[PDB]
Write a protein that binds this ligand. Structure first.
Ligand code: HEM
Ligand SMILES: Cc1ccc(O)cc1
Length: 137
């Protein structure tokens, strides 16, 4: 289930992180409004950009930590407040996070692997509820 999915994603995190984030940017092209350096670049070109690989993996690194600390797919309030208060997130609303978790769950449901797609769906909704509670618009 959810806990095994964290271990599976962590066992190949750079490539899962990049392919899920590319799924998100391709599904929601207007979301490049917060990613000006990613515009006018194919999937392969983005993969060759040092900060694309590094930033994307660091994001999924912390995402996996937030999931690991969660209970029944409900993140800690402290993790939610970190995500609201990060200066890198100053621009964001909960909608940005919903769209990311929509792309993550579609990625898992298209995988041949037995991802607990439903647990990840609840996690993204629970995370959006916690982000809202912690003061994200
Ligand atoms: C659970 C979800 C998320 C986690 C755990 C997370 C975590 C992080 C982390 C660790 C960084 C620092 C990266 C670095 O400096 O190497 C970061 C930066 C950033 N995050 Fe998030 N993030 C999440 C969701 C989002 C979403 C949905 C958006 C926008 C749609 C977003 C936009 C950004 C931006 C714009 C930066 C800074 C620019 C960049 O690193 O390219 N984040 N985030
Ligand atoms: C979600 C994300 C991915 C990459 C990045 O550079 C910033 C944010």
């Amino acid at each position: 289930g959810f806990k095994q999915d964290i271990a599976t994603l962590r066992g190949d995190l750079r490539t899962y992180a990049q392919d899920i984030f590319l799924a998100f940017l391709n599904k929601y092209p207007d979301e490049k409004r917060n990613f000006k350096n990613y515009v006018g670049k194919s999937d392969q070109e983005l993969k060759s950009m040092a900060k694309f690989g590094d930033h994307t993996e660091k994001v999924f690194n912390l995402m996996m930590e937030v999931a690991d600390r969660a209970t029944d797919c409900v993140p800690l309030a402290s993790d939610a407040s970190t995500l609201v208060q990060m200066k890198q997130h100053s621009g964001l609303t909960t909608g940005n996070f919903e769209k990311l978790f929509v792309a993550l769950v579609e990625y898992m449901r298209a995988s041949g692997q037995s991802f607990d797609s439903q647990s990840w769906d609840r996690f993204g909704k629970n995370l959006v509820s916690a982000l809202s509670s912690a003061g994200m618009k």
